[PDB]
Amino acid sequence: RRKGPHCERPLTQEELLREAKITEELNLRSLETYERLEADKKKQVHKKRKCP
Amino acid sequence: EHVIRCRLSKRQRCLYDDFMAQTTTKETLATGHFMSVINILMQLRKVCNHPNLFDPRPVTSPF
Amino acid sequence: VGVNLTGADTVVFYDSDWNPTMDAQAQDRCHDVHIYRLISERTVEENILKKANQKRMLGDMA
Amino acid sequence: WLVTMYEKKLNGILADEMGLGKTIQTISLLAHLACEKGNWGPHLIIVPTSVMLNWEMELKRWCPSFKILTYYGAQKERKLKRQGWTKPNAFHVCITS
């Protein structure tokens, strides 16, 4: 009977959250396009030579 | 959309002709049983598939 | 296996299967596209393909 | 039809023939729930391991606003992904096998 728990930060705003995720859509599309283009322009599946 | 037509092999489908000709298969078909009819139809389809599956060319080697 | 890679044409049906709605699935997946059924002449192929077309029409109208 | 099922609180079974875009239909259902009902939940999606990437790409393509979380990898990677995943709005749609 000395200690006790705590909790805070009860905030979630419906419309502001919708806006926030509609914005995160930008980051998601940027990540997808960046990954796709980087893969296509760097991998170009192939091999290299040996190091003897 | 359109379709295409194919021609039977002049030489090799003589096997199809002989398989359909022999009275044995004709009677086995006339029997009416399901196994005989479906088996003969499967054999005909297979002969219609480059009969090397039905009668492959055997490799020759001296005795 | 799934939605086959699009952009494919000239579907060559090597042999008709006489099974329920086989080429219908290929046509749906494909839908310029072209069809080539390897109809071997001088045989019942014609009548049995007519049967297959009747079966496909019945399955489509069902 | 799916929106009506949701509004009336029933569960659904979509038996459309393969290739008719059931994935797109479910993605549009999620889009409706997100736009008009304000519900972008944690929406679990359990699919075969062969189509997890397909579902992820279809989501990124059609509905770009969903936070997608593909639950794959070794145990350590799964634990790392689960670290903090209980927080609100951490992810919107989870895709697992």
UniProtKB/Swiss-Prot annotation, chain A:
Species of origin: Homo sapiens
Shown residues within the full chain: 157 to 208 of 364
Coiled-coil segments on the chain, per record: none
Free-text description of this protein's post-translational modifications in UniProt: Phosphorylation is enhanced by ZNHIT1 and promotes the interaction of VPS72 with histone H2AZ1.
Residue ranges: DNA binding: 1-50
Name of the molecule in the record: Vacuolar protein sorting-associated protein 72 homolog
Compartment(s) where it occurs, according to its Swiss-Prot or TrEMBL record: Nucleus
Function: Deposition-and-exchange histone chaperone specific for H2AZ1, specifically chaperones H2AZ1 and deposits it into nucleosomes. As component of the SRCAP complex, mediates the ATP-dependent exchange of histone H2AZ1/H2B dimers for nucleosomal H2A/H2B, leading to transcriptional regulation of selected genes by chromatin remodeling.
Subunit structure: Component of the NuA4 histone acetyltransferase complex which contains the catalytic subunit KAT5/TIP60 and the subunits EP400, TRRAP/PAF400, BRD8/SMAP, EPC1, DMAP1/DNMAP1, RUVBL1/TIP49, RUVBL2, ING3, actin, ACTL6A/BAF53A, MORF4L1/MRG15, MORF4L2/MRGX, MRGBP, YEATS4/GAS41 and VPS72/YL1. Component of a NuA4-related complex which contains EP400, TRRAP/PAF400, SRCAP, BRD8/SMAP, EPC1, DMAP1/DNMAP1, RUVBL1/TIP49, RUVBL2, actin, ACTL6A/BAF53A, VPS72 and YEATS4/GAS41. Also part of a multiprotein complex which contains SRCAP and which binds to H2AZ1/H2AZ.
UniProt similarity note: Belongs to the VPS72/YL1 family.
UniProtKB/Swiss-Prot annotation, chain C:
Superkingdom to which the source organism belongs: Eukaryota
Cell compartment(s), UniProt: Nucleus
Subunit record text: Interacts with CREBBP and EP300. May be part of a complex containing SRCAP, CREBBP, CARM1 and GRIP1. Component of the chromatin-remodeling SRCAP complex composed of at least SRCAP, DMAP1, RUVBL1, RUVBL2, ACTL6A, YEATS4, VPS72, ACTR6 and ZNHIT1. Component of a NuA4-related complex which contains EP400, TRRAP/PAF400, SRCAP, BRD8/SMAP, EPC1, DMAP1/DNMAP1, RUVBL1/TIP49, RUVBL2, actin, ACTL6A/BAF53A, VPS72 and YEATS4/GAS41.
Function (record text): Catalytic component of the SRCAP complex which mediates the ATP-dependent exchange of histone H2AZ/H2B dimers for nucleosomal H2A/H2B, leading to transcriptional regulation of selected genes by chromatin remodeling. Acts as a coactivator for CREB-mediated transcription, steroid receptor-mediated transcription, and Notch-mediated transcription.
Record's disease association: Floating-Harbor syndrome: A rare genetic disorder characterized by proportionate short stature, delayed bone age, delayed speech development, and typical facial features. The face is triangular with deep-set eyes, long eyelashes, bulbous nose, wide columella, short philtrum, and thin lips.
Family designation: Belongs to the SNF2/RAD54 helicase family. SWR1 subfamily.
Protein known as: Helicase SRCAP
Species whose genome carries this gene: Homo sapiens
